[PDB]
């Protein structure tokens, strides 16, 4: 008990539309405006800032952004880490506190007209988060291009340490200028938005188009969308959408992506709509997110038996391994000792007992034990390339009798098939 099982978290995004921002931007900071908003007045744990086209040095903004929470909450918030690639910036700030809660700090970019990525992670005791802030290619037409920019800030982003960030984090928000538009004519467009009937407009977004689709960003969460599109207003006020083609469109997203069996609630997902320097909305989102500090305040993990239906026609063996930050190092079996044709594109490969490993976490505690999550792999014999990954969480795995875990594999931005399992928690 003596230390935070739950925090609050803060995350902005904000196209600055390459000029100056006002003065007052109070709205953004405490999710006031259209959507689902708040009202509560007890400042956030961590604020994550991301902007794109934004014109303000880098220690002029991060200035400007701890003057603003010292001006609403009176408290000094502390920067644990900003990263630039030019005109795209992301920036963590935390309460004085939480200070020596922070640990393994890491940052990252990746280029994909300045278009990319810049990123931030961090532990929080025993909790990793990662933080992407993002922006794609512009222009209705290049869905294909966005994807692909997607893909490769996916590949290339060096955060935290696997072979992609997907998996590394317990808890990863990625948001920014997306740039996904609206599949629909202009007249229809602002029929629905005058009537504020968002659903047939989300019908033809772009970007839950290409999610359905399995092309970008496989398995990530978006709140419900509440508010109007925050793209292209005219400068100095929300009035009018300057369209003249550029139809309204939600540019402006948070998605997140986390653990099994862990605790994240939307508290807010937003915009402000009395920002108005900018051609874009800020958009604001805050979460109420679970935090495990029992490590802070002999055991066995066994598996009876693993089967992985694996996307491939290779008749190579397999191997998988076993990573944790719960273990002194990485564990990993022998090869399967049966295998079969599942479909035309999968395999079935099967591991009895005598071909896996017993780890050993690092403390016996039950309630440590029951926060923590491995990560496994799956690899061929021929060349150790990985063929999938996933997570399993210890948190209903702890006790005498084995028990089944069910979970899907993928790779490189593509699902590559599941994995189920028995397996118990000796303590």
């Given at each position: 008990?003596?230390?935070?099982?739950?925090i609050?978290?803060?995350?902005?995004?904000?196209?600055?539309?390459?000029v100056?921002?006002?003065?007052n931007?109070?709205?953004?900071?405490?999710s006031?405006?259209?959507?689902?908003?708040?009202?509560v007045?007890?400042?956030?744990?961590?604020?994550?800032?991301?902007?794109?086209?934004?014109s303000?040095?880098d220690?002029?903004?991060?200035d400007?952004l701890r003057?603003?929470?010292?001006?609403?909450?009176?408290?000094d918030?502390?920067?644990?880490?900003?990263?630039?690639?030019?005109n795209?910036?992301?920036?963590?700030?935390?309460?004085?506190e939480?200070?020596?809660?922070?640990s393994?700090?890491?940052?990252?970019?990746?280029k994909?007209g300045?278009?990319?990525?810049?990123?931030?992670?961090?532990?929080?005791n025993?909790?990793?988060?990662?933080?992407?802030?993002?922006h794609?290619?512009?222009?209705?037409?290049?869905t294909?291009?966005?994807?692909?920019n997607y893909?490769?800030?996916?590949?290339?982003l060096?955060?935290?340490?696997?072979?992609?960030?997907?998996?590394?984090?317990?808890?990863?928000?990625?948001?920014?200028?997306?740039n996904?538009?609206?599949?629909?004519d202009?007249?229809e467009?602002?029929?629905?938005?005058?009537?504020?009937?968002f659903?047939?407009?989300?019908?033809?977004?772009?970007?839950?188009?290409?999610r359905?689709?399995?092309?970008?960003?496989?398995?990530?969460?978006?709140?419900?969308?509440?508010?109007?599109?925050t793209?292209?207003?005219?400068?100095?006020?929300?009035?009018?959408?300057?369209?003249?083609?550029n139809?309204?469109?939600?540019?402006?997203?948070?998605?997140?992506?986390?653990?099994?069996?862990?605790?994240?609630?939307?508290?807010?997902?937003?915009?402000?709509?009395?920002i108005?320097?900018?051609?874009?909305?800020?958009?604001?989102?805050?979460?109420?997110?679970?935090?495990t500090?029992?490590?802070?305040?002999?055991?066995?993990?066994?598996?009876?038996?693993?089967?992985?239906?694996?996307?491939?026609?290779?008749?190579?063996?397999?191997?998988?391994?076993?990573?944790?930050?719960?273990?002194?190092?990485?564990?990993?079996?022998?090869?399967?000792?049966?295998?079969?044709?599942?479909?035309?594109?999968?395999?079935?490969?099967?591991?009895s007992?005598?071909?896996?490993?017993?780890?050993?976490?690092?403390?016996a505690?039950?309630?440590?034990?029951?926060?923590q999550?491995?990560?496994?792999?799956?690899?061929?014999?021929?060349?150790?390339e990985?063929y999938g990954?996933?997570?399993?969480?210890?948190?209903?795995?702890?006790?005498?009798?084995?028990?089944?875990?069910?979970?899907?594999?993928?790779?490189?931005?593509?699902?590559?098939?599941?994995?189920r399992?028995?397996?118990?928690?000796?303590?």
């Amino acid at each position: 008990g003596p230390e935070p099982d739950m925090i609050s978290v803060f995350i902005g995004t904000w196209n600055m539309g390459s000029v100056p921002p006002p003065k007052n931007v109070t709205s953004w900071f405490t999710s006031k405006g259209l959507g689902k908003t708040l009202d509560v007045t007890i400042p956030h744990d961590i604020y994550v800032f991301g902007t794109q086209e934004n014109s303000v040095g880098d220690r002029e903004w991060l200035d400007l952004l701890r003057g603003g929470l010292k001006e609403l909450t009176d408290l000094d918030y502390r920067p644990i880490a900003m990263q630039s690639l030019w005109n795209i910036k992301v920036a963590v700030l935390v309460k004085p506190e939480h200070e020596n809660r922070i640990s393994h700090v890491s940052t990252s970019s990746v280029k994909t007209g300045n278009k990319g990525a810049v990123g931030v992670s961090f532990m929080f005791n025993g909790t990793s988060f990662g933080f992407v802030n993002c922006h794609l290619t512009s222009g209705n037409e290049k869905t294909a291009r966005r994807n692909q920019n997607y893909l490769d800030i996916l590949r290339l982003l060096s955060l935290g340490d696997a072979d992609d960030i997907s998996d590394r984090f317990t808890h990863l928000f990625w948001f920014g200028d997306l740039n996904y538009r609206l599949d629909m004519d202009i007249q229809e467009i602002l029929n629905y938005i005058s009537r504020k009937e968002f659903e047939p407009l989300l019908r033809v977004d772009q970007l839950n188009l290409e999610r359905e689709k399995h092309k970008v960003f496989l398995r990530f969460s978006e709140e419900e969308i509440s508010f109007p599109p925050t793209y292209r207003y005219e400068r100095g006020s929300r009035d009018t959408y300057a369209w003249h083609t550029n139809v309204p469109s939600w540019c402006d997203r948070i998605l997140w992506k986390s653990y099994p069996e862990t605790h994240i609630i939307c508290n807010s997902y937003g915009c402000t709509d009395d920002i108005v320097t900018s051609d874009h909305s800020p958009v604001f989102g805050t979460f109420e997110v679970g935090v495990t500090s029992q490590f802070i305040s002999q055991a066995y993990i066994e598996f009876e038996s693993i089967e992985a239906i694996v996307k491939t026609a290779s008749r190579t063996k397999f191997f998988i391994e076993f990573y944790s930050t719960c273990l002194e190092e990485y564990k990993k079996s022998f090869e399967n000792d049966a295998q079969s044709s599942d479909n035309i594109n999968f395999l079935k490969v099967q591991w009895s007992s005598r071909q896996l490993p017993t780890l050993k976490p690092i403390l016996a505690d039950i309630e440590y034990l029951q926060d923590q999550h491995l990560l496994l792999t799956v690899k061929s014999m021929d060349g150790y390339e990985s063929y999938g990954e996933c997570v399993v969480a210890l948190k209903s795995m702890i006790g005498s009798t084995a028990q089944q875990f069910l979970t899907f594999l993928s790779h490189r931005g593509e699902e590559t098939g599941n994995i189920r399992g028995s397996m118990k928690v000796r303590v």
